[PDB]
Subunit: 265 residues, 2 copies
Protein backbone atom coordinates (compact mmCIF):
# COMPACT_ATOMS: atom_id res chain seq x y z
CA UNK A 1 0.00 0.00 0.00
CA UNK A 2 0.97 3.66 -0.36
CA UNK A 3 0.94 6.22 2.47
CA UNK A 4 -0.15 4.23 5.52
CA UNK A 5 0.05 5.91 8.93
CA UNK A 6 -2.86 4.83 11.13
CA UNK A 7 -2.24 1.99 13.59
CA UNK A 8 -1.39 1.16 17.20
CA UNK A 9 2.39 1.33 17.50
CA UNK A 10 3.53 -1.01 18.88
CA UNK A 11 4.29 -4.26 20.73
CA UNK A 12 7.51 -4.25 18.75
CA UNK A 13 9.52 -2.10 21.15
CA UNK A 14 11.32 -2.87 24.38
CA UNK A 15 9.25 -1.59 27.33
CA UNK A 16 10.92 1.48 28.85
CA UNK A 17 8.21 2.09 31.42
CA UNK A 18 10.45 1.70 34.46
CA UNK A 19 11.47 3.61 37.55
CA UNK A 20 14.91 4.07 35.95
CA UNK A 21 16.53 3.50 32.54
CA UNK A 22 19.24 1.41 34.16
CA UNK A 23 22.87 1.40 35.19
CA UNK A 24 25.75 2.25 32.91
CA UNK A 25 29.18 0.96 33.86
CA UNK A 26 32.04 2.83 32.25
CA UNK A 27 35.42 1.16 32.60
CA UNK A 28 37.99 3.76 31.50
CA UNK A 29 41.42 2.15 31.38
CA UNK A 30 44.18 4.68 30.53
CA UNK A 31 47.18 3.29 32.41
CA UNK A 32 48.42 -0.30 32.21
CA UNK A 33 51.14 -1.99 34.22
CA UNK A 34 54.66 -2.30 32.78
CA UNK A 35 54.43 -6.09 32.92
CA UNK A 36 51.79 -5.54 30.23
CA UNK A 37 53.90 -3.82 27.61
CA UNK A 38 50.95 -1.61 26.62
CA UNK A 39 51.15 2.14 26.09
CA UNK A 40 49.12 4.89 27.76
CA UNK A 41 45.73 5.51 26.21
CA UNK A 42 45.61 9.29 25.82
CA UNK A 43 42.29 10.89 24.98
CA UNK A 44 40.59 7.95 26.74
CA UNK A 45 39.71 10.49 29.41
CA UNK A 46 38.09 12.87 26.91
CA UNK A 47 36.22 9.86 25.61
CA UNK A 48 35.05 8.57 28.99
CA UNK A 49 34.07 12.05 30.11
CA UNK A 50 32.07 12.51 26.93
CA UNK A 51 30.46 9.11 27.40
CA UNK A 52 29.58 9.99 30.96
CA UNK A 53 27.78 13.21 30.10
CA UNK A 54 26.11 11.54 27.16
CA UNK A 55 24.80 8.39 28.78
CA UNK A 56 23.85 10.35 31.90
CA UNK A 57 21.70 12.61 29.71
CA UNK A 58 19.96 9.59 28.23
CA UNK A 59 19.08 8.86 31.82
CA UNK A 60 21.66 6.23 32.78
CA UNK A 61 22.90 5.77 36.36
CA UNK A 62 26.48 5.82 35.17
CA UNK A 63 29.64 5.20 37.22
CA UNK A 64 33.16 5.50 35.83
CA UNK A 65 35.88 3.08 36.91
CA UNK A 66 39.45 3.72 35.81
CA UNK A 67 42.58 1.63 35.34
CA UNK A 68 40.70 -1.48 36.44
CA UNK A 69 42.54 -4.78 36.68
CA UNK A 70 41.28 -7.92 35.03
CA UNK A 71 40.11 -8.98 38.48
CA UNK A 72 38.49 -5.59 39.07
CA UNK A 73 36.74 -5.47 35.71
CA UNK A 74 35.50 -8.96 36.20
CA UNK A 75 34.53 -8.12 39.77
CA UNK A 76 32.31 -5.13 39.15
CA UNK A 77 30.64 -6.66 36.12
CA UNK A 78 29.73 -9.68 38.27
CA UNK A 79 28.53 -7.33 40.97
CA UNK A 80 26.31 -5.44 38.53
CA UNK A 81 24.75 -8.73 37.39
CA UNK A 82 24.42 -9.53 41.08
CA UNK A 83 22.06 -6.57 41.61
CA UNK A 84 18.27 -6.36 41.27
CA UNK A 85 17.23 -4.51 38.14
CA UNK A 86 13.54 -5.05 38.68
CA UNK A 87 12.87 -1.33 38.34
CA UNK A 88 15.21 -0.84 35.38
CA UNK A 89 14.57 -0.65 31.64
CA UNK A 90 17.97 -2.02 30.65
CA UNK A 91 21.68 -2.19 31.39
CA UNK A 92 24.70 -0.80 29.61
CA UNK A 93 28.42 -1.35 29.94
CA UNK A 94 31.13 0.61 28.16
CA UNK A 95 34.70 -0.60 27.80
CA UNK A 96 37.59 1.67 26.85
CA UNK A 97 40.94 -0.13 26.60
CA UNK A 98 43.43 -1.96 24.38
CA UNK A 99 42.00 -4.83 22.42
CA UNK A 100 43.36 -8.13 21.19
CA UNK A 101 41.57 -11.28 20.04
CA UNK A 102 38.23 -11.65 21.82
CA UNK A 103 39.81 -9.94 24.81
CA UNK A 104 40.01 -6.52 26.43
CA UNK A 105 43.00 -5.17 28.30
CA UNK A 106 42.94 -4.62 32.05
CA UNK A 107 45.33 -2.58 34.20
CA UNK A 108 47.37 -5.74 34.68
CA UNK A 109 46.76 -8.23 31.89
CA UNK A 110 44.12 -9.31 29.38
CA UNK A 111 40.62 -10.50 30.20
CA UNK A 112 38.15 -12.04 27.68
CA UNK A 113 34.88 -10.24 26.89
CA UNK A 114 33.15 -13.62 27.25
CA UNK A 115 33.71 -13.40 30.98
CA UNK A 116 32.38 -9.84 31.38
CA UNK A 117 29.21 -10.86 29.56
CA UNK A 118 29.00 -14.24 31.31
CA UNK A 119 27.43 -12.70 34.40
CA UNK A 120 24.25 -12.03 32.40
CA UNK A 121 24.17 -15.13 30.17
CA UNK A 122 20.58 -16.35 30.05
CA UNK A 123 19.51 -17.80 33.42
CA UNK A 124 21.86 -15.59 35.42
CA UNK A 125 20.55 -12.33 36.25
CA UNK A 126 16.85 -12.95 35.96
CA UNK A 127 16.03 -9.34 36.81
CA UNK A 128 17.42 -8.25 33.41
CA UNK A 129 15.72 -10.91 31.28
CA UNK A 130 13.58 -9.68 28.36
CA UNK A 131 15.50 -6.40 28.78
CA UNK A 132 18.39 -5.14 26.65
CA UNK A 133 21.97 -5.42 27.87
CA UNK A 134 24.09 -3.04 25.86
CA UNK A 135 27.83 -3.40 25.48
CA UNK A 136 29.71 -0.53 23.89
CA UNK A 137 33.31 -1.46 23.34
CA UNK A 138 36.29 0.52 22.17
CA UNK A 139 39.31 -1.78 22.15
CA UNK A 140 41.86 -1.13 19.42
CA UNK A 141 45.15 -3.09 19.21
CA UNK A 142 48.23 -1.64 20.90
CA UNK A 143 50.54 0.78 19.11
CA UNK A 144 53.47 -1.37 20.23
CA UNK A 145 57.00 0.04 20.35
CA UNK A 146 57.10 0.38 16.57
CA UNK A 147 60.31 -1.62 16.15
CA UNK A 148 62.87 1.02 17.08
CA UNK A 149 65.88 -0.11 19.09
CA UNK A 150 66.27 -3.89 19.27
CA UNK A 151 65.68 -4.97 22.87
CA UNK A 152 65.46 -8.29 24.73
CA UNK A 153 61.95 -9.74 24.65
CA UNK A 154 60.24 -13.12 24.55
CA UNK A 155 56.63 -14.40 24.81
CA UNK A 156 55.75 -16.75 27.68
CA UNK A 157 53.19 -19.55 27.48
CA UNK A 158 51.87 -20.26 30.98
CA UNK A 159 48.36 -19.50 32.23
CA UNK A 160 45.77 -20.91 34.63
CA UNK A 161 44.18 -22.70 31.67
CA UNK A 162 40.95 -20.81 30.99
CA UNK A 163 40.28 -20.11 27.28
CA UNK A 164 37.26 -17.87 26.70
CA UNK A 165 36.71 -17.01 23.03
CA UNK A 166 32.95 -17.43 22.61
CA UNK A 167 30.91 -14.31 23.49
CA UNK A 168 27.73 -16.46 23.27
CA UNK A 169 24.85 -15.23 21.11
CA UNK A 170 22.28 -14.56 23.84
CA UNK A 171 18.98 -12.77 23.32
CA UNK A 172 18.43 -9.09 24.14
CA UNK A 173 22.15 -8.39 23.86
CA UNK A 174 23.58 -5.72 21.56
CA UNK A 175 27.26 -5.03 20.92
CA UNK A 176 28.79 -1.95 19.33
CA UNK A 177 32.45 -2.91 18.88
CA UNK A 178 35.14 -0.57 17.56
CA UNK A 179 38.74 -1.35 16.66
CA UNK A 180 39.34 2.12 15.27
CA UNK A 181 42.46 3.55 17.01
CA UNK A 182 43.46 7.17 17.53
CA UNK A 183 46.87 8.46 18.57
CA UNK A 184 48.41 10.06 15.49
CA UNK A 185 49.73 13.07 17.42
CA UNK A 186 53.18 14.27 18.49
CA UNK A 187 52.56 15.36 22.08
CA UNK A 188 49.35 13.31 22.00
CA UNK A 189 46.94 15.92 23.44
CA UNK A 190 44.03 13.52 23.01
CA UNK A 191 41.13 14.64 20.81
CA UNK A 192 38.95 11.61 21.51
CA UNK A 193 38.26 8.59 19.31
CA UNK A 194 36.10 8.95 16.21
CA UNK A 195 33.74 6.23 17.35
CA UNK A 196 33.13 7.63 20.79
CA UNK A 197 32.80 11.13 19.50
CA UNK A 198 30.31 9.95 16.87
CA UNK A 199 28.40 7.73 19.27
CA UNK A 200 28.15 10.66 21.68
CA UNK A 201 27.42 13.46 19.22
CA UNK A 202 24.66 11.48 17.57
CA UNK A 203 23.28 10.02 20.77
CA UNK A 204 22.97 13.45 22.37
CA UNK A 205 20.76 14.64 19.51
CA UNK A 206 18.72 11.57 18.53
CA UNK A 207 19.00 9.37 21.59
CA UNK A 208 15.39 10.26 22.30
CA UNK A 209 13.87 10.16 18.81
CA UNK A 210 15.84 7.50 16.94
CA UNK A 211 15.87 3.77 17.58
CA UNK A 212 19.17 2.31 18.76
CA UNK A 213 19.96 0.69 15.42
CA UNK A 214 19.40 4.00 13.65
CA UNK A 215 21.86 5.78 15.90
CA UNK A 216 24.49 3.07 15.70
CA UNK A 217 24.17 3.08 11.94
CA UNK A 218 24.74 6.85 11.72
CA UNK A 219 27.73 6.41 14.01
CA UNK A 220 29.02 3.84 11.53
CA UNK A 221 28.61 6.13 8.57
CA UNK A 222 30.14 8.96 10.62
CA UNK A 223 33.23 6.97 11.51
CA UNK A 224 33.20 5.76 7.91
CA UNK A 225 33.37 9.23 6.37
CA UNK A 226 36.72 9.56 8.15
CA UNK A 227 38.24 6.99 5.80
CA UNK A 228 36.78 8.68 2.73
CA UNK A 229 38.43 12.03 3.50
CA UNK A 230 42.07 13.10 3.78
CA UNK A 231 44.09 12.75 6.98
CA UNK A 232 46.48 15.67 6.45
CA UNK A 233 50.26 15.38 6.06
CA UNK A 234 51.65 13.38 3.09
CA UNK A 235 52.43 9.65 3.32
CA UNK A 236 50.38 9.54 6.53
CA UNK A 237 47.28 7.46 5.79
CA UNK A 238 45.74 4.58 7.77
CA UNK A 239 43.86 1.39 6.85
CA UNK A 240 40.07 1.80 6.74
CA UNK A 241 38.17 0.96 9.93
CA UNK A 242 34.45 0.65 10.65
CA UNK A 243 32.52 0.10 13.88
CA UNK A 244 30.69 -3.20 14.13
CA UNK A 245 27.22 -3.83 15.48
CA UNK A 246 26.14 -7.25 16.66
CA UNK A 247 22.46 -7.27 17.62
CA UNK A 248 20.62 -10.06 19.37
CA UNK A 249 17.88 -7.61 20.26
CA UNK A 250 14.31 -8.83 19.87
CA UNK A 251 12.57 -5.48 19.91
CA UNK A 252 13.19 -1.88 18.95
CA UNK A 253 15.23 0.08 21.49
CA UNK A 254 14.21 3.62 22.32
CA UNK A 255 15.64 5.57 25.21
CA UNK A 256 12.27 7.25 25.62
CA UNK A 257 8.57 6.64 26.25
CA UNK A 258 6.33 9.41 24.93
CA UNK A 259 6.46 13.15 24.24
CA UNK A 260 9.79 14.99 24.51
CA UNK A 261 12.15 16.13 27.26
CA UNK A 262 11.72 19.49 29.01
CA UNK A 263 14.54 21.97 28.37
CA UNK A 264 12.65 25.27 28.56
CA UNK A 265 13.10 27.60 31.53
CA UNK B 1 21.45 21.70 21.06
CA UNK B 2 24.51 21.69 18.81
CA UNK B 3 23.30 22.28 15.25
CA UNK B 4 20.33 24.29 14.00
CA UNK B 5 19.80 24.30 10.23
CA UNK B 6 17.44 21.39 9.53
CA UNK B 7 18.82 19.46 6.55
CA UNK B 8 17.08 16.15 7.25
CA UNK B 9 15.85 14.69 3.96
CA UNK B 10 16.43 12.23 5.51
CA UNK B 11 19.46 11.40 3.33
CA UNK B 12 20.12 8.61 5.78
CA UNK B 13 18.84 5.84 3.52
CA UNK B 14 20.73 3.84 0.90
CA UNK B 15 19.81 5.19 -2.54
CA UNK B 16 17.59 2.59 -4.20
CA UNK B 17 17.08 4.43 -7.48
CA UNK B 18 18.55 1.84 -9.83
CA UNK B 19 17.46 -0.24 -12.79
CA UNK B 20 17.61 -3.43 -10.70
CA UNK B 21 17.32 -4.23 -6.95
CA UNK B 22 20.24 -6.57 -7.33
CA UNK B 23 21.17 -10.22 -7.63
CA UNK B 24 20.22 -12.73 -4.95
CA UNK B 25 22.28 -15.92 -4.99
CA UNK B 26 20.80 -18.81 -3.01
CA UNK B 27 23.10 -21.75 -2.35
CA UNK B 28 20.95 -24.63 -1.25
CA UNK B 29 23.01 -27.52 0.08
CA UNK B 30 20.92 -30.55 1.02
CA UNK B 31 23.12 -33.52 0.20
CA UNK B 32 26.66 -34.03 1.37
CA UNK B 33 29.29 -36.69 0.80
CA UNK B 34 29.37 -39.39 3.47
CA UNK B 35 33.07 -38.68 4.13
CA UNK B 36 32.02 -35.34 5.58
CA UNK B 37 30.03 -37.40 8.03
CA UNK B 38 27.19 -34.97 7.41
CA UNK B 39 23.58 -35.93 6.91
CA UNK B 40 20.88 -34.77 4.56
CA UNK B 41 15.53 -32.27 5.13
CA UNK B 42 13.39 -29.14 4.97
CA UNK B 43 16.01 -27.09 3.10
CA UNK B 44 14.25 -27.33 -0.28
CA UNK B 45 11.21 -25.74 1.33
CA UNK B 46 13.42 -23.02 2.73
CA UNK B 47 15.08 -22.46 -0.61
CA UNK B 48 11.71 -22.30 -2.34
CA UNK B 49 10.35 -19.84 0.18
CA UNK B 50 13.41 -17.67 -0.10
CA UNK B 51 13.50 -17.70 -3.89
CA UNK B 52 9.85 -16.70 -4.09
CA UNK B 53 10.20 -14.17 -1.27
CA UNK B 54 13.27 -12.41 -2.57
CA UNK B 55 11.90 -12.62 -6.09
CA UNK B 56 8.72 -10.77 -5.21
CA UNK B 57 10.94 -8.37 -3.32
CA UNK B 58 12.44 -7.38 -6.64
CA UNK B 59 15.66 -9.39 -6.59
CA UNK B 60 17.03 -11.40 -9.50
CA UNK B 61 17.26 -14.80 -7.76
CA UNK B 62 19.46 -17.72 -8.77
CA UNK B 63 19.33 -21.01 -6.91
CA UNK B 64 22.26 -23.40 -6.63
CA UNK B 65 22.07 -26.86 -5.16
CA UNK B 66 24.33 -29.43 -3.52
CA UNK B 67 27.36 -27.32 -4.27
CA UNK B 68 30.99 -28.18 -3.69
CA UNK B 69 33.25 -25.88 -1.71
CA UNK B 70 35.00 -25.06 -4.99
CA UNK B 71 31.70 -24.20 -6.65
CA UNK B 72 30.52 -22.19 -3.68
CA UNK B 73 33.81 -20.33 -3.62
CA UNK B 74 33.76 -20.07 -7.44
CA UNK B 75 30.31 -18.73 -8.23
CA UNK B 76 30.53 -16.25 -5.37
CA UNK B 77 33.79 -14.84 -6.84
CA UNK B 78 32.58 -14.55 -10.41
CA UNK B 79 29.57 -12.74 -8.97
CA UNK B 80 31.78 -10.06 -7.41
CA UNK B 81 33.47 -9.93 -10.80
CA UNK B 82 30.23 -8.90 -12.53
CA UNK B 83 29.17 -5.28 -13.01
CA UNK B 84 26.66 -4.25 -10.36
CA UNK B 85 26.48 -0.62 -11.47
CA UNK B 86 22.79 -0.93 -12.35
CA UNK B 87 22.13 -2.64 -9.03
CA UNK B 88 20.90 -1.08 -5.78
CA UNK B 89 22.32 -3.89 -3.62
CA UNK B 90 23.38 -7.51 -3.38
CA UNK B 91 22.14 -10.56 -1.50
CA UNK B 92 23.35 -14.08 -0.86
CA UNK B 93 21.68 -16.77 1.17
CA UNK B 94 23.53 -19.88 2.28
CA UNK B 95 21.68 -22.98 3.49
CA UNK B 96 23.95 -25.73 4.71
CA UNK B 97 25.75 -27.40 7.61
CA UNK B 98 27.67 -25.12 9.91
CA UNK B 99 30.82 -25.37 11.96
CA UNK B 100 32.67 -22.64 13.82
CA UNK B 101 33.78 -20.10 11.24
CA UNK B 102 33.14 -22.51 8.42
CA UNK B 103 30.24 -23.63 6.25
CA UNK B 104 29.82 -26.99 4.55
CA UNK B 105 29.99 -27.63 0.85
CA UNK B 106 29.01 -31.05 -0.51
CA UNK B 107 32.58 -32.33 -0.29
CA UNK B 108 33.94 -30.49 2.74
CA UNK B 109 33.93 -27.23 4.68
CA UNK B 110 34.97 -23.74 3.67
CA UNK B 111 35.30 -20.56 5.75
CA UNK B 112 32.45 -18.07 5.16
CA UNK B 113 35.03 -15.31 5.60
CA UNK B 114 36.35 -16.39 2.24
CA UNK B 115 32.94 -16.68 0.66
CA UNK B 116 32.07 -13.08 1.53
CA UNK B 117 35.51 -11.56 1.31
CA UNK B 118 35.02 -11.66 -2.45
CA UNK B 119 32.79 -8.59 -2.28
CA UNK B 120 35.10 -6.45 -0.19
CA UNK B 121 35.16 -2.95 -1.64
CA UNK B 122 38.54 -3.19 -3.33
CA UNK B 123 37.32 -6.33 -5.12
CA UNK B 124 33.93 -5.42 -6.10
CA UNK B 125 33.93 -1.74 -6.78
CA UNK B 126 30.54 -1.88 -8.52
CA UNK B 127 28.92 -2.54 -5.13
CA UNK B 128 30.93 0.10 -3.28
CA UNK B 129 28.70 2.03 -0.85
CA UNK B 130 26.02 -0.52 -1.65
CA UNK B 131 24.50 -3.04 0.81
CA UNK B 132 25.90 -6.57 0.61
CA UNK B 133 23.43 -8.75 2.50
CA UNK B 134 24.35 -12.24 3.60
CA UNK B 135 21.66 -14.35 5.17
CA UNK B 136 23.01 -17.58 6.58
CA UNK B 137 21.26 -20.71 7.87
CA UNK B 138 23.98 -23.06 9.07
CA UNK B 139 23.10 -25.05 12.18
CA UNK B 140 25.62 -27.56 13.51
CA UNK B 141 25.02 -31.01 12.09
CA UNK B 142 24.33 -34.14 14.15
CA UNK B 143 22.42 -37.42 14.20
CA UNK B 144 19.35 -38.07 16.33
CA UNK B 145 20.69 -39.95 19.36
CA UNK B 146 18.07 -41.86 21.35
CA UNK B 147 18.32 -45.37 22.76
CA UNK B 148 20.18 -46.44 25.89
CA UNK B 149 19.36 -44.52 29.07
CA UNK B 150 22.10 -42.15 30.22
CA UNK B 151 22.51 -39.66 33.07
CA UNK B 152 23.70 -37.05 30.57
CA UNK B 153 22.05 -35.55 27.50
CA UNK B 154 23.19 -33.52 24.44
CA UNK B 155 25.93 -30.90 24.75
CA UNK B 156 26.78 -27.90 22.58
CA UNK B 157 28.72 -24.62 22.51
CA UNK B 158 27.75 -21.01 21.82
CA UNK B 159 31.12 -20.00 20.36
CA UNK B 160 30.28 -17.06 18.09
CA UNK B 161 32.51 -13.97 17.84
CA UNK B 162 31.79 -12.16 14.51
CA UNK B 163 35.38 -11.20 13.53
CA UNK B 164 36.86 -14.30 11.88
CA UNK B 165 33.53 -15.02 10.23
CA UNK B 166 32.79 -11.61 8.71
CA UNK B 167 34.80 -9.22 6.52
CA UNK B 168 34.01 -6.21 8.75
CA UNK B 169 33.64 -3.60 6.02
CA UNK B 170 31.18 -0.79 5.44
CA UNK B 171 27.84 -1.82 3.94
CA UNK B 172 28.03 -5.45 4.93
CA UNK B 173 25.18 -7.10 6.81
CA UNK B 174 25.09 -10.63 8.16
CA UNK B 175 22.23 -12.57 9.64
CA UNK B 176 23.57 -15.87 10.94
CA UNK B 177 21.39 -18.68 12.27
CA UNK B 178 22.72 -21.84 13.85
CA UNK B 179 19.32 -23.17 14.85
CA UNK B 180 18.88 -26.79 13.77
CA UNK B 181 15.75 -28.33 12.32
CA UNK B 182 14.57 -30.70 15.05
CA UNK B 183 11.39 -32.70 14.33
CA UNK B 184 13.63 -35.49 13.04
CA UNK B 185 11.64 -38.32 14.64
CA UNK B 186 8.99 -39.04 12.01
CA UNK B 187 7.62 -35.70 10.81
CA UNK B 188 9.11 -34.43 7.51
CA UNK B 189 10.99 -31.16 7.15
CA UNK B 190 8.88 -28.03 7.63
CA UNK B 191 11.78 -25.64 7.06
CA UNK B 192 13.96 -23.76 9.54
CA UNK B 193 12.28 -21.31 11.90
CA UNK B 194 14.71 -18.58 10.92
CA UNK B 195 14.02 -18.95 7.23
CA UNK B 196 10.26 -19.17 7.70
CA UNK B 197 10.39 -16.17 10.01
CA UNK B 198 12.49 -14.14 7.60
CA UNK B 199 10.35 -14.92 4.56
CA UNK B 200 7.09 -14.45 6.42
CA UNK B 201 8.02 -11.10 7.96
CA UNK B 202 9.54 -10.14 4.63
CA UNK B 203 6.32 -10.80 2.71
CA UNK B 204 4.24 -8.66 5.05
CA UNK B 205 6.79 -5.86 5.63
CA UNK B 206 9.58 -6.28 3.10
CA UNK B 207 8.61 -3.00 1.48
CA UNK B 208 7.65 -0.93 4.51
CA UNK B 209 10.20 -1.73 7.20
CA UNK B 210 13.90 -1.07 7.42
CA UNK B 211 16.14 -4.14 7.26
CA UNK B 212 17.15 -3.97 10.94
CA UNK B 213 13.47 -3.68 11.84
CA UNK B 214 12.69 -6.73 9.78
CA UNK B 215 15.68 -8.64 11.12
CA UNK B 216 14.91 -7.78 14.71
CA UNK B 217 11.38 -9.04 14.24
CA UNK B 218 12.85 -12.30 12.95
CA UNK B 219 15.02 -12.52 16.07
CA UNK B 220 12.03 -12.26 18.36
CA UNK B 221 9.96 -14.53 16.10
CA UNK B 222 12.67 -17.19 16.27
CA UNK B 223 13.24 -16.52 19.97
CA UNK B 224 9.61 -17.04 20.93
CA UNK B 225 10.11 -20.70 19.93
CA UNK B 226 11.56 -21.12 23.42
CA UNK B 227 8.89 -19.72 25.72
CA UNK B 228 8.66 -22.26 28.55
CA UNK B 229 7.34 -25.47 26.99
CA UNK B 230 8.79 -27.97 29.47
CA UNK B 231 7.93 -30.22 32.41
CA UNK B 232 11.09 -31.19 34.30
CA UNK B 233 14.45 -29.35 34.32
CA UNK B 234 16.23 -31.80 32.00
CA UNK B 235 14.26 -32.44 28.81
CA UNK B 236 14.00 -29.12 26.96
CA UNK B 237 15.06 -27.51 23.66
CA UNK B 238 18.23 -25.41 24.04
CA UNK B 239 17.28 -21.72 23.73
CA UNK B 240 18.80 -20.29 20.56
CA UNK B 241 18.65 -17.02 18.61
CA UNK B 242 19.99 -15.66 15.31
CA UNK B 243 22.77 -13.12 15.30
CA UNK B 244 22.76 -9.98 13.20
CA UNK B 245 25.99 -8.23 12.35
CA UNK B 246 25.71 -4.85 10.67
CA UNK B 247 28.36 -2.64 9.12
CA UNK B 248 25.70 -0.83 7.15
CA UNK B 249 26.20 2.92 6.98
CA UNK B 250 22.68 3.82 6.00
CA UNK B 251 19.07 2.65 6.47
CA UNK B 252 18.05 -0.08 4.06
CA UNK B 253 14.57 -0.10 2.62
CA UNK B 254 13.61 -2.46 -0.17
CA UNK B 255 11.36 0.16 -1.74
CA UNK B 256 12.10 3.25 -3.86
CA UNK B 257 12.47 6.77 -2.45
CA UNK B 258 9.37 8.71 -3.48
CA UNK B 259 9.13 12.40 -4.39
CA UNK B 260 11.14 14.39 -1.85
CA UNK B 261 13.12 17.64 -1.74
CA UNK B 262 10.57 19.85 0.02
CA UNK B 263 11.32 21.41 3.41
CA UNK B 264 11.26 24.91 4.90
Amino acid sequence: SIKTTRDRVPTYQYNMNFEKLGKCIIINNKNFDKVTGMGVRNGTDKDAEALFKCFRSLGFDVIVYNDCSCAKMQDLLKKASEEDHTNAACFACILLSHGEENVIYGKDGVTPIKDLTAHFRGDRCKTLLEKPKLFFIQAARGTELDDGIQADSGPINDTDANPRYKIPVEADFLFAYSTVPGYYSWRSPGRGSWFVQALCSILEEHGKDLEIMQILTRVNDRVARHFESQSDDPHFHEKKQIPCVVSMLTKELYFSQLEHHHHHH
